[PDB]
Design an enzyme around this catalytic site. Structure first.
Site, PDB file in Angstrom:
ATOM      1  N   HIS A  40       0.836  -1.214   0.000  1.00 34.91           N
ATOM      2  CA  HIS A  40       0.000   0.000   0.000  1.00 34.91           C
ATOM      3  C   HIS A  40       0.863   1.252   0.000  1.00 34.91           C
ATOM      4  O   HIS A  40       0.350   2.347  -0.176  1.00 34.91           O
ATOM      5  CB  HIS A  40      -1.025   0.019   1.145  1.00 34.91           C
ATOM      6  N   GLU A  52      19.505   7.177   8.230  1.00 37.30           N
ATOM      7  CA  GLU A  52      18.798   8.341   8.752  1.00 37.30           C
ATOM      8  C   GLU A  52      18.487   8.293  10.240  1.00 37.30           C
ATOM      9  O   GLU A  52      18.238   7.218  10.788  1.00 37.30           O
ATOM     10  CB  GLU A  52      17.481   8.489   7.983  1.00 37.30           C
ATOM     11  N   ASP A  84       0.074  -7.598   1.955  1.00 33.27           N
ATOM     12  CA  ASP A  84       0.584  -6.217   1.989  1.00 33.27           C
ATOM     13  C   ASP A  84       2.111  -6.176   2.034  1.00 33.27           C
ATOM     14  O   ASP A  84       2.711  -5.835   3.063  1.00 33.27           O
ATOM     15  CB  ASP A  84      -0.003  -5.423   3.166  1.00 33.27           C
ATOM     16  N   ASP A 171       1.570   1.808  20.155  1.00 31.90           N
ATOM     17  CA  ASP A 171       1.253   1.273  18.823  1.00 31.90           C
ATOM     18  C   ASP A 171       2.135   1.944  17.765  1.00 31.90           C
ATOM     19  O   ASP A 171       2.861   2.891  18.061  1.00 31.90           O
ATOM     20  CB  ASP A 171      -0.219   1.575  18.527  1.00 31.90           C
ATOM     21  N   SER A 172       2.091   1.441  16.537  1.00 35.01           N
ATOM     22  CA  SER A 172       2.576   2.202  15.402  1.00 35.01           C
ATOM     23  C   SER A 172       1.424   3.107  14.960  1.00 35.01           C
ATOM     24  O   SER A 172       0.305   2.968  15.451  1.00 35.01           O
ATOM     25  CB  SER A 172       3.056   1.290  14.265  1.00 35.01           C
ATOM     26  N   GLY A 175       2.484   7.005   9.052  1.00 38.64           N
ATOM     27  CA  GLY A 175       3.864   7.369   8.739  1.00 38.64           C
ATOM     28  C   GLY A 175       4.803   6.222   9.045  1.00 38.64           C
ATOM     29  O   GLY A 175       5.973   6.249   8.666  1.00 38.64           O
ATOM     30  N   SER A 177       3.915   2.935   8.322  1.00 45.17           N
ATOM     31  CA  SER A 177       3.687   1.899   7.308  1.00 45.17           C
ATOM     32  C   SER A 177       4.934   1.505   6.542  1.00 45.17           C
ATOM     33  O   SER A 177       5.775   2.341   6.225  1.00 45.17           O
ATOM     34  CB  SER A 177       2.669   2.376   6.267  1.00 45.17           C
ATOM     35  N   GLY A 178       5.018   0.225   6.205  1.00 47.75           N
ATOM     36  CA  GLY A 178       6.133  -0.287   5.451  1.00 47.75           C
ATOM     37  C   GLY A 178       7.327  -0.615   6.319  1.00 47.75           C
ATOM     38  O   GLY A 178       8.193  -1.368   5.891  1.00 47.75           O
TER      39      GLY A 178
END
Lengths: 223, 53, 223
Positions: A40, A52, A84, A171-172, A175, A177-178
């Site tokens: 997604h 980073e 996903d 939680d996550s 931003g 995601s992935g």
């Protein structure tokens, strides 16, 4: 990450940021040329940013490499978020050091109760919006499949798992995601979806990466 | 609003909206979102009606 | 049934009407004591009406029997509509004859292209609202699961098939749920769902009964 802590610069060396003008998702470096993300998170014109910490500041350990190709899972289901999972090839191989390092793929699936590390530059609030610039980390356990399905009735496929806290507060969030869910030094998960963030009885849902090891291995082998 | 609305073929019908949107969402009570910028959100409420497109 | 034809009184003898004060769903008589319907048709206070043609007139061959129990599939998912199958036991065995007859369960699944008979007392219009009130019938082939998934991206499970016509015009509709899809003398499907009725590229989706024969068998043997 809601409820987390500041990871420390380069302590999560496999964590990558995906950029198209702004940070939009995370991903995980699995070798010098390939990043694992969520399907997604698919977008054209992706630049992978490795090394980073503060993503609004060049701090001197970054490597910015454009994606040359993106491979979304053949069965990625847009409606249900099943499968996903996405592969992104780096147009030039990254240089691997103590601060830019690949993360191992699992040989076996992780069990409920296993503690994992979840990381990202997503929202830090379960109500409202504050975006950190430094990378945040969360230690959270894998929840039983049973616990996951009861939280999200009819929404959890075999390619998902829940991790986190039913009480809420950790939680996550958007931003994130992935990005990685790493347990016992293997990439067991990919930040995927939820209802809100850090809400009671609404844990984070993650891609079950152990179901994908052989598509990853064969895909990278021929691309 | 709703574009894609499947319904069971019973009386009454059981209907939901399978529209993926970004906004999520006052009228909707059960709404799942991916954790990206922008989010990809769905309303998983089941109702009598649709709504219109 | 949109685009169908008047069956003829009692020409579909395994067809039943489920009544809770009004017709709400259909079903299929599979032996003298058990009806097969959809799980989404679950309702308390069900009366099974057998031997019907006009559901608004007592015509002399009907048998009305209350449900002694309903058993929804254990893995029925009201969100995705996966496992949309229910077993209903009759309070007394129906009298089987020419006009009230059971339908054979399948011993193998039906491949795409097979012509089937679909029936019910549901809506006959794809836009507005008109109810028969005699039993309507429709001849329609099973569509490839490839066509099915193309019609409803992400929505189709291994427990579903599409049947009908991609051109639109001919389909099941609201009021037809729980009813039979019979192919070569076997109950291959249960009327389930769709996006509207008889719409272009929106064929009907049906429960794939052949996946359930073993559950059906063991459940009847024990209840």
């Amino acid at each position: 990450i809601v409820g987390g802590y500041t990871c420390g610069a380069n302590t999560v060396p496999y964590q990558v940021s995906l950029n198209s003008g702004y940070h939009f998702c995370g991903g995980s470096l699995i070798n010098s040329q390939w990043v694992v993300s969520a399907a997604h998170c698919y977008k054209s014109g992706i630049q992978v940013r490795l090394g980073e910490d503060n993503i609004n500041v060049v701090e001197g350990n970054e490597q910015f490499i454009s994606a040359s190709k993106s491979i979304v899972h053949p069965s990625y289901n847009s409606n249900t978020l099943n499968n996903d999972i996405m592969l992104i090839k780096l147009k030039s191989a990254a240089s691997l050091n103590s601060r830019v390092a690949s993360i191992s793929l699992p040989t076996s699936c992780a069990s409920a109760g296993t503690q994992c590390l979840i990381s990202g530059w997503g929202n830090t609030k379960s109500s409202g919006t504050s975006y950190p610039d430094v990378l945040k980390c969360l230690k959270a356990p894998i929840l039983s499949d049973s616990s996951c399905k009861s939280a999200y009735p009819g929404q959890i496929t075999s390619n998902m798992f829940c991790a986190g806290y039913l009480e809420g507060g950790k939680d996550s969030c958007q931003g994130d995601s992935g990005g990685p869910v790493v347990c016992s030094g293997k990439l067991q998960g990919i930040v995927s979806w939820g209802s809100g963030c850090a809400q009671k009885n609404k844990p984070g849902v993650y891609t079950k990466v152990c179901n994908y090891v052989s598509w990853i291995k064969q895909t990278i082998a021929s691309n | 609003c709703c574009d894609f609305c499947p319904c069971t073929r019973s009386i009454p019908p059981q209907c939901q909206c399978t529209d993926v949107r970004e906004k999520c969402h006052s009228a909707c009570k059960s709404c799942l979102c991916t954790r990206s910028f922008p989010p990809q959100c769905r309303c998983y409420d089941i109702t009598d009606f649709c709504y219109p497109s």
